[PDB]
Short mmCIF file of C-alpha atoms in Angstrom, two decimals:
data_model
loop_
_atom_site.label_atom_id
_atom_site.label_comp_id
_atom_site.label_asym_id
_atom_site.label_seq_id
_atom_site.Cartn_x
_atom_site.Cartn_y
_atom_site.Cartn_z
CA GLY H 1 12.02 -6.25 -17.61
CA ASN H 2 12.67 -9.59 -15.95
CA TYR H 3 12.24 -9.51 -12.17
CA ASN H 4 13.30 -13.05 -11.21
CA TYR H 5 16.93 -12.23 -10.46
CA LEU H 6 17.48 -11.10 -6.89
CA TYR H 7 20.26 -10.11 -4.53
CA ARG H 8 20.92 -9.45 -0.87
CA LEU H 9 21.18 -5.76 -0.07
CA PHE H 10 20.80 -5.55 3.73
CA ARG H 11 22.92 -7.79 5.95
CA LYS H 12 24.24 -7.25 9.46
CA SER H 13 27.74 -8.44 8.52
CA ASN H 14 30.19 -8.65 5.64
CA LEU H 15 30.86 -11.90 3.81
CA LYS H 16 34.02 -13.86 4.42
CA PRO H 17 35.35 -15.23 1.11
CA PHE H 18 33.43 -18.10 -0.51
CA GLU H 19 30.62 -17.82 2.05
CA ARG H 20 27.03 -18.29 0.94
CA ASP H 21 24.04 -16.94 2.87
CA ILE H 22 20.41 -17.39 1.84
CA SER H 23 18.60 -16.54 5.07
CA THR H 24 15.34 -14.58 4.79
CA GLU H 25 15.17 -12.46 7.94
CA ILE H 26 13.87 -8.89 7.72
CA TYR H 27 16.75 -6.52 8.38
CA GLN H 28 16.17 -4.50 11.54
CA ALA H 29 17.07 -0.84 11.07
CA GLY H 30 15.73 0.64 14.33
CA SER H 31 15.95 -0.44 17.96
CA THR H 32 12.72 -2.47 17.98
CA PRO H 33 12.78 -6.11 16.83
CA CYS H 34 11.00 -6.76 13.55
CA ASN H 35 9.27 -9.95 14.74
CA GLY H 36 8.51 -10.70 11.11
CA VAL H 37 6.92 -7.28 10.52
CA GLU H 38 8.27 -5.20 7.65
CA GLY H 39 7.79 -1.45 7.44
CA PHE H 40 9.00 0.94 10.12
CA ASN H 41 12.61 0.25 11.17
CA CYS H 42 12.41 -3.00 9.18
CA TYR H 43 13.51 -3.75 5.63
CA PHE H 44 13.56 -6.90 3.55
CA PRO H 45 17.19 -8.02 3.06
CA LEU H 46 16.73 -8.57 -0.69
CA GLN H 47 16.07 -6.55 -3.83
CA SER H 48 15.36 -7.53 -7.41
CA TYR H 49 16.48 -6.48 -10.88
CA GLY H 50 14.60 -4.91 -13.73
CA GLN L 1 6.62 20.47 11.72
CA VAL L 2 4.42 19.54 8.75
CA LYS L 3 6.17 17.07 6.45
CA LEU L 4 3.47 16.04 3.95
CA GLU L 5 0.01 17.03 2.75
CA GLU L 6 -3.13 15.43 1.37
CA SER L 7 -5.74 17.47 -0.47
CA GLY L 8 -7.71 17.48 -3.70
CA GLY L 9 -10.82 15.59 -2.60
CA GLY L 10 -14.37 16.81 -2.92
CA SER L 11 -18.05 15.90 -3.00
CA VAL L 12 -18.79 14.51 -6.47
CA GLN L 13 -21.02 11.68 -7.65
CA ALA L 14 -20.23 8.24 -9.01
CA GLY L 15 -18.70 8.89 -12.41
CA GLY L 16 -17.28 12.28 -11.43
CA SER L 17 -13.70 13.46 -11.81
CA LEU L 18 -11.15 15.35 -9.70
CA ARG L 19 -7.41 15.34 -9.02
CA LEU L 20 -5.52 14.53 -5.82
CA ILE L 21 -2.30 16.20 -4.68
CA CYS L 22 0.22 14.40 -2.49
CA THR L 23 2.83 17.14 -2.04
CA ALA L 24 6.17 15.63 -1.02
CA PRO L 25 8.69 18.33 -0.04
CA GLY L 26 12.01 16.57 -0.62
CA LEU L 27 11.28 12.99 -1.65
CA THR L 28 13.48 13.42 -4.74
CA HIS L 29 16.36 13.79 -2.30
CA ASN L 30 14.89 11.27 0.15
CA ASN L 31 14.19 8.77 -2.68
CA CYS L 32 11.95 6.60 -0.50
CA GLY L 33 8.79 4.94 -1.76
CA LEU L 34 5.24 6.26 -1.78
CA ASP L 35 1.85 4.66 -1.06
CA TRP L 36 -1.73 5.85 -1.37
CA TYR L 37 -4.03 4.47 1.31
CA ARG L 38 -7.68 4.93 2.23
CA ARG L 39 -9.87 4.28 5.26
CA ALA L 40 -13.60 3.53 5.37
CA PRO L 41 -15.80 4.26 8.41
CA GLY L 42 -15.93 1.39 10.88
CA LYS L 43 -13.24 -0.57 9.02
CA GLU L 44 -9.47 -0.57 9.34
CA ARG L 45 -7.12 1.18 6.92
CA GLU L 46 -6.86 -0.60 3.57
CA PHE L 47 -4.20 -0.54 0.86
CA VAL L 48 -4.90 1.46 -2.29
CA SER L 49 -1.88 1.94 -4.53
CA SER L 50 1.91 1.96 -4.56
CA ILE L 51 4.65 3.77 -6.46
CA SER L 52 8.34 2.99 -6.01
CA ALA L 53 11.51 5.06 -6.25
CA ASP L 54 12.08 4.05 -9.90
CA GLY L 55 8.55 4.77 -11.14
CA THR L 56 7.01 1.29 -11.05
CA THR L 57 3.31 1.65 -10.27
CA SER L 58 0.75 -0.75 -8.84
CA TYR L 59 -2.99 -0.53 -8.22
CA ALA L 60 -5.51 -2.36 -6.06
CA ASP L 61 -7.92 -4.90 -7.52
CA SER L 62 -10.94 -2.78 -6.57
CA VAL L 63 -9.34 0.26 -8.24
CA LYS L 64 -7.51 -1.20 -11.26
CA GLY L 65 -8.63 0.11 -14.63
CA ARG L 66 -9.60 3.67 -13.73
CA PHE L 67 -7.07 5.01 -11.21
CA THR L 68 -3.95 6.75 -12.51
CA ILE L 69 -1.02 7.46 -10.21
CA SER L 70 1.83 9.56 -11.57
CA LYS L 71 5.01 11.12 -10.18
CA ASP L 72 6.26 14.59 -11.05
CA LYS L 73 9.50 15.02 -12.94
CA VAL L 74 10.46 17.84 -10.54
CA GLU L 75 9.12 19.26 -7.27
CA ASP L 76 7.58 16.08 -5.90
CA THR L 77 3.78 16.39 -5.78
CA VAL L 78 2.49 12.96 -6.70
CA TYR L 79 -0.90 12.83 -8.39
CA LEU L 80 -3.60 10.19 -7.99
CA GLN L 81 -6.08 11.08 -10.70
CA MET L 82 -9.41 9.32 -10.19
CA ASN L 83 -11.86 8.77 -13.05
CA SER L 84 -15.07 6.77 -13.51
CA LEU L 85 -16.01 7.19 -9.87
CA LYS L 86 -18.08 4.47 -8.22
CA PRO L 87 -20.04 4.47 -4.94
CA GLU L 88 -17.41 2.24 -3.31
CA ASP L 89 -14.92 5.14 -3.50
CA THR L 90 -16.36 6.98 -0.48
CA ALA L 91 -13.37 6.92 1.88
CA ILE L 92 -10.53 9.06 3.18
CA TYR L 93 -7.20 9.09 1.32
CA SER L 94 -3.82 9.35 3.02
CA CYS L 95 -0.14 9.38 2.03
CA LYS L 96 3.01 7.87 3.49
CA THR L 97 6.67 8.69 2.95
CA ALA L 98 10.03 8.10 4.65
CA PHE L 99 12.61 10.67 5.74
CA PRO L 100 16.24 10.78 6.92
CA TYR L 101 17.17 10.14 10.54
CA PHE L 102 20.33 8.66 12.07
CA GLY L 103 21.80 9.57 8.69
CA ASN L 104 20.09 6.71 6.84
CA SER L 105 17.58 8.52 4.64
CA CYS L 106 14.38 6.51 5.09
CA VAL L 107 14.29 5.22 8.68
CA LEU L 108 11.63 7.65 9.92
CA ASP L 109 8.35 6.85 8.20
CA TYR L 110 5.67 9.53 8.40
CA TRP L 111 2.02 9.70 7.31
CA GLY L 112 -0.13 12.60 6.25
CA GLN L 113 -3.54 13.19 7.80
CA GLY L 114 -5.89 12.39 4.92
CA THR L 115 -8.79 13.87 2.94
CA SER L 116 -12.27 12.38 2.61
CA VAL L 117 -14.52 12.00 -0.43
CA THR L 118 -18.23 11.03 -0.37
CA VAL L 119 -19.46 9.43 -3.59
CA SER L 120 -23.17 9.54 -4.41
#
């Protein structure tokens, strides 16, 4: 199963039409800033395909 | 207020065999990922193995070839069978899982205590 293809799955806002966004900031879920640390209250905004 | 468990260790030599039991109560519903970790005395906690929500498995470089992680079809109690034990395996295992809170069903991550094995 190819794993190259990827997609955003965690973004703080919806997309206005014809708007691209390729930022790579860990999505904060809790009330503590991620500061580049994934794990608790922090999720990577992307997810791949199999 | 106990949400996970770790047991199944023992005191067996290098080359011995035994089965581990990470009993997850409702991870099928929770559908969050699972990781096996271990700690060695005097050293910080180190990664051991990972299993995802879809059944993709991954093993550490110091454990690849002999460790076998598997997930139940029902009644989540994930197994980490160890075989061909080596003296480097003396450490304490632990689990980690995520649970619902604020509605979102992973946000609260929670760790079990852990169970130690001494390999001679």
